[PDB]
């Protein structure tokens, strides 16, 4: 009961934030698609990614071990809004370096929130429902992403100045400066809305009183240490395996979506990349639908069994995708996300549940494996080009899902 209301709030707050955030995702390109283009500095943007999803996690966890989950969530929510707030001004004065800075900051909020919010929800109540809790909250996440794209993308990209790069090319310098500014001007109000949303969320959390948790506690001082927590983590095996599992999931997932439109265009005559995007959309819908249903499953059933089931089906879909072509392989690929759905939350929960003190530090690592999303692309490109076509590369995701299934039948403990 006292575990329940905070939870429902977290869900709504997951949803809400999920809107403010993917809202930020729609607009950020515009800064870039307007001030096009550049070479070296582009790599600097990708670095925010590793920064936030590799560096910040462990420190974040340390913050948490020493303070708590709410502390980490708060600062994470704090980091995000600060970083998001930097954009508008960097734009309005055309200071890139400032933009880049806010980007790293918002990037840290992300790694911070990831490492914070996930273990928190699964611990937010009885041990069994840890998996269902995280999954359901993640559904509200997915759902929030749904909404922004819907009620938001249309009702917000119809106020931003469209421009054929050719017109931009033909502009005088004065004109270009004028354009760029009118552009950053149109987005700056929705950004205030965003930050506003992010803030209120942070607010509600401070207002919200949660019950205590054997994993937030401090009864240790020496053994509460990093390496103490760490040396203990090696055997645990299910944790060490979920780590490997999440690396693969992220690799798998980005392999699928990142290469999807290329697959479509090279596989189906005559696809425009414009039209292919439609399939990409369907994928996110499968993903949300996939999660809703999977969570209904996670409530009825042993999570690992659902995880294992889903891992197999997705791997199937991918083999089908790799060996089929035309529309048959496409649909299989785009339908695959319906089964990726449950995977990340379920992997995460099986992974920690249950680590107690080491829950925090264990999470820091699971988060870092998001680096796998980055490591896969070269391999996708490599295998793809080495083979002459996109589909044979789709064996790689499949290879991931396979591994993940092994974990599912290897999630066990005690």
Ligand X SMILES: CCCCCCCCCO[C@@H]1O[C@H](CO)[C@@H](O)[C@H](O)[C@H]1O
Question: Which residues here bind ligand X, judged by CB under 6 A?
Answer: 10, 13-14, 17-18, 21-22, 73, 110, 113-114, 117, 141, 145, 201, 205
In whole angstroms, the minimum distance from the beta carbon of 197 to ligand X comes to 10
Based on CB atoms, which residue is closest to ligand X, 112 or 322?
112
Whether 310 and 341 have beta carbons less than 8 Å apart is answered as yes
Query: CA-CA distance, 197 to 202, in Å (whole number)?
Result: 9
What span, in angstroms and rounded, lies between the C-alpha atoms of 171 and 157? 22
Q: How far is the CB of 11 from ligand X (least distance, A)?
A: 9
User: At closest approach, how far in Å is the CB of 250 from ligand X?
Assistant: 8
CA 166 remoteness from chain centre = 34
Nearest approach in angstroms of CB 269 to ligand X is: 33
CB of 113 to ligand X, least distance (A): 4
Q: Could you tell me the smallest distance in angstroms from the CB atom of residue 242 to ligand X? A: 16
| Cβ nearer to ligand X, comparing 109 with 329 | 109
Structure tokens at 50: 């590793």
Provide the sign of the torsion angle of the four alpha carbons 269, 275, 277, 283, taken in this order. negative
Between 201 and 400, name the residue whose CB sits nearer to ligand X: 201
The Cα angle at residue 222 between residues 216 and 228, in degrees rounded to 5: 80
Output phi, psi for 234, to 5 deg.
Answer: -70, 110
Nearest distance from C-beta of residue 107 to ligand X, angstroms: 11
Dihedral of CA atoms 240, 244, 250, 253 in degrees, nearest 10, equals -130
Give 21 or 321: the residue with its C-beta nearer to ligand X.
21
* Alpha helices (H) along 208-325: 226-233, 238-267, 273-300, 303-323
Q: Which is nearer to ligand X, 16 or 396 (CB)?
A: 16
Residue placing its CB nearer to ligand X in the complex, 190 or 329: 190
> Count of alpha carbons within 13 Å of 172, Cβ hemisphere only?
3
CB of residue 138 to ligand X, shortest distance in Å: 7
Q: Report CA 308 to chain centroid distance, whole Å.
A: 21
Considering the complex, state which of residue 345 and residue 391 has its C-beta at the smaller distance from ligand X: 345
Closest contact distance (angstroms) between CB of 144 and ligand X is 7
User: What is residue 69's three-state secondary structure?
Assistant: helix
For ligand X, which is the closer residue by CB, 311 or 366? 366
State which residue, 246 or 384, has the beta carbon closest to ligand X. Answer: 246
- Cβ at position 274, least distance to ligand X in Å: 24
Q: Given the structure tokens 């299910």, which residue do they identify? A: 238
How open is the CA angle 95-84-282, to the nearest 5 degrees? 115
Among all residues, whose Cβ is closest to ligand X?
13
Q: Quick one: which of 311, 122, 86 has its CA closest to 198?
A: 86
Q: In a 3-state reduction of DSSP, which class is residue 390? A: coil
Nearer CB in complex with ligand X: 78/96: 78
Q: Which helix (H) or strand (E) holds 302?
A: none
Angstrom distance (rounded) from CA 371 to CA 196: 30
Smaller CB separation from ligand X, 21 or 357:
21
Max distance between CA atoms of the chain, in angstroms, equals 70
Q: Is 36 exposed, middle or buried (0-12, 13-18, 19+ CB in 10 A)?
A: exposed
What is the smallest separation between the CB atom of 367 and ligand X, expressed in angstroms? 8
DSSP secondary structure string, 263-289? HHHHHSTT--HHHHHHHHHHHHHHHHH
């Amino acid at each position: 009961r006292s575990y329940i209301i905070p939870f429902a709030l977290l869900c709504s707050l997951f949803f809400l934030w999920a809107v403010a955030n993917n809202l930020n995702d729609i607009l950020l390109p515009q800064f870039q698609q307007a001030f096009t283009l550049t070479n070296f500095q582009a790599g600097l943007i990708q670095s925010a990614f590793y920064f936030g999803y590799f560096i910040i996690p462990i420190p974040a966890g340390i913050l948490m071990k020493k303070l708590s989950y709410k502390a980490g969530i708060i600062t994470g929510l704090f980091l995000y809004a600060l970083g998001a707030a930097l954009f508008w001004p960097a734009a309005e004065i055309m200071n890139y370096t400032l933009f880049l800075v806010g980007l790293f900051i918002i990037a840290a909020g992300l790694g911070c929130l990831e490492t914070a919010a996930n273990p928190f929800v699964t611990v937010l109540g009885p041990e069994s429902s840890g998996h269902f809790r995280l999954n359901l909250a993640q559904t509200f996440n997915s759902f929030g992403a749904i909404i922004a794209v819907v009620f938001g993308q249309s009702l917000i990209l119809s106020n931003v100045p469209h421009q054929s790069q050719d017109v931009l090319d033909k502009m005088s310098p004065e004109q270009l400066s004028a354009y760029k500014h009118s552009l950053v001007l149109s987005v700056q109000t929705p950004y205030m809305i965003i930050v506003a949303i992010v803030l209120l969320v942070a607010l509600l959390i401070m207002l919200t009183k949660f019950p205590a948790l054997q994993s937030d506690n401090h009864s240790d001082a020496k053994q509460g240490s990093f390496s103490a927590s760490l040396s203990r983590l090696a055997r645990i095996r299910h944790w060490r395996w979920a780590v490997l599992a999440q690396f693969c999931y992220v690799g798998a997932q980005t392999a699928c979506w990142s290469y999807l439109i290329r697959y479509a265009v090279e596989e189906i005559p005559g696809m425009t990349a414009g039209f292919a995007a439609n399939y990409l959309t369907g994928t996110m819908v499968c993903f949300f639908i996939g999660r809703f249903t999977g969570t209904w499953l996670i409530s009825r059933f042993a999570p690992h069994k659902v995880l294992a089931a889903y891992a197999l089906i997705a791997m199937a879909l991918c083999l089908i995708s790799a060996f089929a072509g035309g529309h048959v392989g496409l649909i299989a690929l785009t339908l695959c996300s319906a089964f990726m759905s449950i995977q990340y939350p379920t992997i995460f929960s099986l992974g920690i549940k249950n680590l107690g003190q080491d829950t925090k530090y264990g999470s820091s690592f699971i988060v870092m494996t998001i680096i796998g999303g980055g490591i896969v692309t070269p391999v996708m490109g490599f295998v793809s080009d080495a083979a002459g076509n996109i589909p044979t590369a789709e064996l790689i995701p499949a290879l991931c899902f396979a591994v993940i299934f092994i974990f599912a039948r290897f999630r066990s403990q005690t």
